[PDB]
mmCIF file of C-alpha atoms in Angstrom:
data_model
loop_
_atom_site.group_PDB
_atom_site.id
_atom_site.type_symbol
_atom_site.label_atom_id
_atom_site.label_comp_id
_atom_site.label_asym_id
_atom_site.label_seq_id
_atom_site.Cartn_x
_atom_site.Cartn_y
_atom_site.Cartn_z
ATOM 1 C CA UNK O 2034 -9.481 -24.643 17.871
ATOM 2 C CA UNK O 2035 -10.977 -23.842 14.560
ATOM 3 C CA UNK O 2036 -10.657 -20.093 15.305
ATOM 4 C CA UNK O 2037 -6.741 -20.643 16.152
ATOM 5 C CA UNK O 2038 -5.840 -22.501 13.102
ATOM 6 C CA UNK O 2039 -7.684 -20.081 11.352
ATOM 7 C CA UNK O 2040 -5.863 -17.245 13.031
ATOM 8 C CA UNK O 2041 -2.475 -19.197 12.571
ATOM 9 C CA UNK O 2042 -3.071 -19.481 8.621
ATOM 10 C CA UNK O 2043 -3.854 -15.436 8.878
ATOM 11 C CA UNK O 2044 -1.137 -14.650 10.011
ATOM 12 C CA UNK O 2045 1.573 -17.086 8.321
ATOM 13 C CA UNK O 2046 -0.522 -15.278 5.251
ATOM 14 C CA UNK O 2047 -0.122 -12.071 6.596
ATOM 15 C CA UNK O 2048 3.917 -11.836 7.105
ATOM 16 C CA UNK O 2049 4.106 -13.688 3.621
ATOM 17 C CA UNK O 2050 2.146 -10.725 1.985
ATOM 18 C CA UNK O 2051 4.326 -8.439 3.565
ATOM 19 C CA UNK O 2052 7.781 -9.987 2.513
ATOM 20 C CA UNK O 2053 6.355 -10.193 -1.178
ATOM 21 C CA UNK O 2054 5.326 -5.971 -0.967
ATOM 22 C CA UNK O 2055 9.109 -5.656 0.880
ATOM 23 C CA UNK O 2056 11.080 -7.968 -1.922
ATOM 24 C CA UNK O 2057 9.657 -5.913 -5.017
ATOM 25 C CA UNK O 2058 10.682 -2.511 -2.833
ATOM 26 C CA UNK O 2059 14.026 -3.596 -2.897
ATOM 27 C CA UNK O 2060 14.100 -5.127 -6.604
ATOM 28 C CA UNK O 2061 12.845 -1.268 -7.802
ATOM 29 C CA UNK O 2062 15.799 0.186 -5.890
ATOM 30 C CA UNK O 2063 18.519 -2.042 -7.167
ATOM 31 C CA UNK O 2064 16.419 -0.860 -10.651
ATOM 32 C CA UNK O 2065 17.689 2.442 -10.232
ATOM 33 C CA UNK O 2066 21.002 1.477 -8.931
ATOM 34 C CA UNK O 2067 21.338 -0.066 -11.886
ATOM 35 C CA UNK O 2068 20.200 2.552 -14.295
ATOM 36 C CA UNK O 2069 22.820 5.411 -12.705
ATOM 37 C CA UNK O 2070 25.678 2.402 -13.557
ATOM 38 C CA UNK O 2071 24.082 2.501 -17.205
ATOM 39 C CA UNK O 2072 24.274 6.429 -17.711
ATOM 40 C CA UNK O 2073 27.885 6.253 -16.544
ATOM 41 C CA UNK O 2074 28.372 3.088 -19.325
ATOM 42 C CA UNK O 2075 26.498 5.088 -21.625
ATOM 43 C CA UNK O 2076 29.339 8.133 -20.934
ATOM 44 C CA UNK O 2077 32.011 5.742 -21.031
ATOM 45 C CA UNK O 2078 31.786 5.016 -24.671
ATOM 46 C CA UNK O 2079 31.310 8.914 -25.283
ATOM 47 C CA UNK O 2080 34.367 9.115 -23.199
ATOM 48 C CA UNK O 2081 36.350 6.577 -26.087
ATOM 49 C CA UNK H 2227 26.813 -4.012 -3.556
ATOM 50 C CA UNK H 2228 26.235 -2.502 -0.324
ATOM 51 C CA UNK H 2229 22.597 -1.597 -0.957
ATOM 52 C CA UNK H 2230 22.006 -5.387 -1.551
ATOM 53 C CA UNK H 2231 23.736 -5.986 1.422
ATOM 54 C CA UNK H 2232 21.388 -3.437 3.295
ATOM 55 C CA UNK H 2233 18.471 -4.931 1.229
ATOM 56 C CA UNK H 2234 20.080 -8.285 2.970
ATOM 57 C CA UNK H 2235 19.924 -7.284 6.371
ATOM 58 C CA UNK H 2236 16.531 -6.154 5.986
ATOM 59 C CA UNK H 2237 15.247 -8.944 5.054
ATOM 60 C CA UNK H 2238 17.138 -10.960 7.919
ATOM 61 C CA UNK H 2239 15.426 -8.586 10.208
ATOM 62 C CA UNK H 2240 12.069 -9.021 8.470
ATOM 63 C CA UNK H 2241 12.469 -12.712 9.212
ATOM 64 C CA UNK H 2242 13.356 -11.913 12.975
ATOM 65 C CA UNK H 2243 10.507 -9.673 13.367
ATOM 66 C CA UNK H 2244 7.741 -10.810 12.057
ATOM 67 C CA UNK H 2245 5.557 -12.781 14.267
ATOM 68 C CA UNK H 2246 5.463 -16.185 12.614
ATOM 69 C CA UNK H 2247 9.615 -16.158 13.698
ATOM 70 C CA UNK H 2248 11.219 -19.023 14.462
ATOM 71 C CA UNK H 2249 10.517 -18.131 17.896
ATOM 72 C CA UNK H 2250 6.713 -19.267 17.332
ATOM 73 C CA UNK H 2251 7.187 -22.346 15.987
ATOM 74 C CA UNK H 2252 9.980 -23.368 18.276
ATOM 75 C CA UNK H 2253 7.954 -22.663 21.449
ATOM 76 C CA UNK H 2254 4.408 -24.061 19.696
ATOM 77 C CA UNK H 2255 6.107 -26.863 18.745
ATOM 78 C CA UNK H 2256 6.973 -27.194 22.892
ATOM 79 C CA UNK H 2257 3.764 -26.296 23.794
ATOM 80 C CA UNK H 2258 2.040 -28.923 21.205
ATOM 81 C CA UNK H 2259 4.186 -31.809 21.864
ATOM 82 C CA UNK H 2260 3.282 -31.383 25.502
ATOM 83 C CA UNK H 2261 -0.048 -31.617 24.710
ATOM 84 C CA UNK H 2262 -0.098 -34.389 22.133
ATOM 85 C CA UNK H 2263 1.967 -36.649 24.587
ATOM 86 C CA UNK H 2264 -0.042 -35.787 27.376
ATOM 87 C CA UNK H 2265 -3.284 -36.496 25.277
ATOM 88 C CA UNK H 2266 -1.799 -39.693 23.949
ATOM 89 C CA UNK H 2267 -1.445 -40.856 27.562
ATOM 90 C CA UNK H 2268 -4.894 -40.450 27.922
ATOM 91 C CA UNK H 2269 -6.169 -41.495 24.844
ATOM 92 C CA UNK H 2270 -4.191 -44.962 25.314
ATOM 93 C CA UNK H 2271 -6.388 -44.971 28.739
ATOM 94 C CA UNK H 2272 -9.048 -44.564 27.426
ATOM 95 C CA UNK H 2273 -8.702 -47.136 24.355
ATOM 96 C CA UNK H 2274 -7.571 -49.872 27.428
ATOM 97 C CA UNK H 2275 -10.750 -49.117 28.883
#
């Protein structure tokens, strides 16, 4: 029973390691989302 | 918008997914509370003895 709490806390630590490495995946591509919306603000003003 | 919204779903099926679900806990907890009645019965048994 010391093995399967063990093993429990392993993997509850596992799937939280994952959702960190998946959560800044997604922040970098709303990053560069948000850099193509700058470029077109940026061309906007050039525009006026 | 709609890449958070994919970014959204993802996660939602991260969280379905990945083995410690809410799945696991809700048939652990079954499993446990079987157990920790059952033991209690026998515990109190024991304690009257």
């Amino acid at each position: 029973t010391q093995f399967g709490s063990t093993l429990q806390n392993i993997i509850e630590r596992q799937d939280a390691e994952a959702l960190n490495a998946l959560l800044q995946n997604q922040a970098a591509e709303l990053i560069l989302t948000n850099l193509s919306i700058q470029d077109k603000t940026i061309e906007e003003l050039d525009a006026e | 918008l709609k890449t958070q919204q994919e970014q959204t779903q993802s996660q939602l099926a991260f969280l379905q997914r990945k083995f410690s679900n809410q799945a696991l806990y809700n048939w652990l907890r079954g499993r446990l509370a079987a157990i920790y009645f059952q033991f209690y019965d026998l515990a109190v048994a024991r304690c009257l003895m």
